[PDB]
Amino acid sequence: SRMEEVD
Amino acid sequence: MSQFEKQKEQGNSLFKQGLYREAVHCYDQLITAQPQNPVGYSNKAMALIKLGEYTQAIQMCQQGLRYTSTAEHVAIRSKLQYRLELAQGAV
Ligand SMILES: [Cl-]
Q1: CB-based contact, B77 to chain A, within 8 Å
Q2: Which domain holds residue B8?
Q3: Which 3 state secondary structure label does DSSP give A5?
Q4: Rounded to whole angstroms, how far apart are CA atoms B60 and B25?
Q5: DSSP of B52-88, one letter per residue?
Q6: Which of A3, A4, A6 is facing B43, going by the closest CB pair?
């Protein structure tokens, strides 16, 4: 996912 | 899905819903269940940042990095974003 997103 | 992955999807669903304290609480259960898995710390740090809880975020980042190996395929965008903050910090 993107830098601003969770995993 | 394992129980960890189910609890993690719930925290992530709360996070995507903009329910950050609620997500933090689920992420705490990830940390408790799997203390050497960086994902709980990383996810908890994002939810904290959304809440303006910067000090606890720093603590979660430092803790999660203790359980993270090298990452050898880092995206350029990631490096630009990290180096921007690193340098802003150092000024
Ligand atoms: Cl990356």
Answers
A1: yes
A2: 2-91
A3: coil
A4: 14
A5: T-HHHHHHHHHHHHTT----SS--HHHHHHHHHHHHH
A6: A6
Name the residue in chain B with its Cα closest to that of A3. B78
At what resolution in Å was this solved?
2.0
Q: Cα angle vertex B13, ends B35, B57, to 5°?
A: 45
Query: What was the elucidation method?
Result: X-ray
**Domain count across chain B:** 1
Q: Are B26 and B10 in contact (CB under 8 A)?
A: yes
Separation in Å, CA B27 to CA B4, B42, B89: 10, 9, 27
Residue B12 sits at the vertex; the CA angle it makes with B11 and B15, to the nearest 5 degrees, is: 90
Distance B85 CA to ligand 1 centre (A): 15
Torsion of the alpha carbons at B1, A4, B86 and B79, rounded to the nearest 10: 80
Cβ–Cβ below 8 Å for B12 and A6: yes
∠ CA(B18), CA(B83), CA(B76), 5° rounding? 80
